[PDB]
């Protein structure tokens, strides 16, 4: 039948080094690839557990390629496990990755391509950026991003930042629900659209400038779902500048029609990382 081709790899053309992760996501294994882009390079493979369904991910993995999107480079099905082959991301997923460089980090980290600690302004703003470039790009295809968080998103090589996977843990609820960044719309009327996904990407950005914090992580599942419903809205993080958390705010507008356009949002995120205010305090 038609549909998208997708590139295909051999498997004695993949060579797994050692597993980076496991989670909602499967297992994901550092790996070196031949003949990719032409001599051997390493990616990131994403062996699946249990066949339907990975076909149609594939395809649409496929079509969805941007600056902003992890690179997907194909699949081998030649044998189980079934695999999926992206380009590798050194820094892994962006919530660890702020979480290793808060104030609150226990070790130093990096990398001889980020400093160790906490980072610029300049910097936190040019993640948001990033990952709302991408979002802009799904929005334009009428791709719903069901799981928009910083969880998954991927940070590679220079703090070049890419969303990572696609939702095809505490911070779920019993289906799972990320129902710390999700709208009202969503938990009230089992709705969610392109305005959610900007309702959610204001949560990400309060986890960027909160290095990673959970949403009401003080709070129960049912309590954070209290706090949505009735209008309550996180509070401005201490490394936040005020322009950022009008930014934010203009996300979580009840009505999903007043929030602002992905286009809107990643236009003043992208002035303010060409030039970011001075901000202490
Ligand atoms: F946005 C996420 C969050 C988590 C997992 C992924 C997986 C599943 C889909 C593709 N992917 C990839 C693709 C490339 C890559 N390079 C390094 C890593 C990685 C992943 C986990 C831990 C350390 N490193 N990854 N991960 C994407």
Not at 4 to 27: C, N, Q, S
Not at 75 to 101: A, I, K, Q
Request: net charge positive.
């Amino acid at each position: 039948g038609s549909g998208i081709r997708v590139h295909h790899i051999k498997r004695r053309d993949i060579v797994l080094k050692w597993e980076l992760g496991e989670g909602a996501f499967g297992k994901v294994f550092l790996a070196e690839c031949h003949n990719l882009l032409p001599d051997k390079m390493l990616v990131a493979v994403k062996a699946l557990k249990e066949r339907q369904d990975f076909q149609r991910e594939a395809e649409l993995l496929t079509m969805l390629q941007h600056q902003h999107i992890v690179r997907f480079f194909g699949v081998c099905t030649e044998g189980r496990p079934l695999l999926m082959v992206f380009e590798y991301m050194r820094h892994g997923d962006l919530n660890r990755f702020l979480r290793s460089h808060g104030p609150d980090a226990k070790l130093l980290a990096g990398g001889e391509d980020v400093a160790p600690g906490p980072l610029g302004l300049g910097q936190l703003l040019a993640v948001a950026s990033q990952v709302a470039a991408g979002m802009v790009y799904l929005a334009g295809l009428h791709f719903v991003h069901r799981d928009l968080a910083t969880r998954n998103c991927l940070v590679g090589q220079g703090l070049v930042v890419k969303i990572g996977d696609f939702g095809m843990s505490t911070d779920y609820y019993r289906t799972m629900l990320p129902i710390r960044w999700m709208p009202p719309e969503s938990i009230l009327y089992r709705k969610f659209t392109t305005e959610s996904d900007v309702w959610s990407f204001g949560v990400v950005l309060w986890e960027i400038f909160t290095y990673g914090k959970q949403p009401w992580y003080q709070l129960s599942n049912t309590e954070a779902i209290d706090c949505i419903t009735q209008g309550r809205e996180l509070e401005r993080p201490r490394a936040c500048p005020p322009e950022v958390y009008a930014i934010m705010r203009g996300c979580w507008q009840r009505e999903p029609q007043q929030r602002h356009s992905i286009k809107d949002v990643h236009a003043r995120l992208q002035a303010l990382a060409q030039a970011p205010p001075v901000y202490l305090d």
